[PDB]
Amino acid sequence: QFGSTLLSLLERKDSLSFDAYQMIQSGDLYRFSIDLQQQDIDINKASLE
Amino acid sequence: QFGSTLLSLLERKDSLSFDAYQMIQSGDLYRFSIDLQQQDIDINKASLE
Amino acid sequence: QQQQAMALLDYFSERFTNESLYTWLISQLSSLYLQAYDAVLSLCLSAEA
Amino acid sequence: SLLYELNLGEQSFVGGGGWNDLYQGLMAGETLKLALMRMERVYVEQNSR
């Protein structure tokens, strides 16, 4: 029962920690990509200017 | 118990190894696609040039 | 993306619960399971006799 | 106790290592089961009227 128990829960930890690293660390995407619009707005502004 | 055990864990190996193979081997995508930006930058440069 | 991806694969590999442990088990387990078969054989033979 | 009946002299079937650090000793009981069963075989074999 211990074996099965630890096995299941460790595998749970593993999986959740996989997505955990993925979600927490990759979440910087929006901040990093702010420029996508934050400068294209100026792109359009310069046209009429 | 042996049967069930080995069954469960082998299926674990199978599933995880499927995505493992997928992630490790397909990960070449960014290196392969570097040119996407690495040459469009020159595309735009040539315009004003 | 590529850099954090290879770091992810490393992190995934450093599971501290690897399938290699699982292989160690199953191999051992399988031998034990053989020995178990051997026991049962003796039991049933003697029984039927 | 088995030896007190069997009186086959000292031989040992129990073994260490059932506990392991790395593998957290996951199969010791199975090891015992093995020993147990074979000893049971010996028991019915040598208990002999």
Query: DSSP labels for B1-49?
Result: -HHHHHHHHHHHHHHHHHHHHHHHHHTTHHHHTTHHHHTHHHHHHHHH-
What does the alpha-carbon distance between residue C8 and residue C10 come to, in Å, rounded to a whole number?
5
| Residue C8 CA from chain centroid, whole number | 25
What does the alpha-carbon distance between residue D7 and residue D33 come to, in Å, rounded to a whole number?
22
* D13, D27, D45, D48, best to mutate vs chain C, most C CBs in 10 Å: D27
What does the alpha-carbon distance between residue D23 and residue C25 come to, in Å, rounded to a whole number?
9
Distance from CA of C12 to the nearest CA of D (A): 19
Q: Which long-range contacts (CB under 8 A, 24 or more apart) does B3-12 make?
A: B5/C29, B6/C26, B6/C29, B6/C30, B9/A7, B9/C22, B9/C25, B9/C26, B10/C26, B12/A11, B12/C19, B12/C22
What does the alpha-carbon distance between residue C9 and residue B7 come to, in Å, rounded to a whole number?
26
- Pairwise CB contact (< 8 Å): C29 & B2: yes
Taking contacts as CB-CB distances below 8 angstroms, the residues of chain A near C12 are 18
What does the alpha-carbon distance between residue C2 and residue C8 come to, in Å, rounded to a whole number?
10
- Resolution, expressed in angstroms to one decimal: 6.4
Of the candidates A15, D39, D33, C8, the one whose C-alpha atom is nearest the C-alpha of residue B2 is D33
Distance from CA of D38 to the nearest CA of C (A): 7
Say which experimental method was used: cryo-EM
* C17, C19, C24, C40, best to mutate vs chain D, most D CBs in 10 Å: C24
CA R_g for chain C: 21
- Spatial neighbors of D1 by CB under 8 A, at least 6 apart, are none
What does the alpha-carbon distance between residue A28 and residue A37 come to, in Å, rounded to a whole number?
16
What does the alpha-carbon distance between residue C28 and residue B10 come to, in Å, rounded to a whole number?
15
Q: What is the 3-state secondary structure (H, E, C) of chain D?
A: CHHHHHCCCCCCCCCCCCCCCCCCCCCHHHHHHHHHHHHHHHHHHHCCC
| Continuous segment of H or E residues that includes residue A11 | helix A2-26
What does the alpha-carbon distance between residue D26 and residue D29 come to, in Å, rounded to a whole number?
8
Identity of the residue in C4, C12, C15 whose CB atom sits nearest the CB atom of A26 = C4
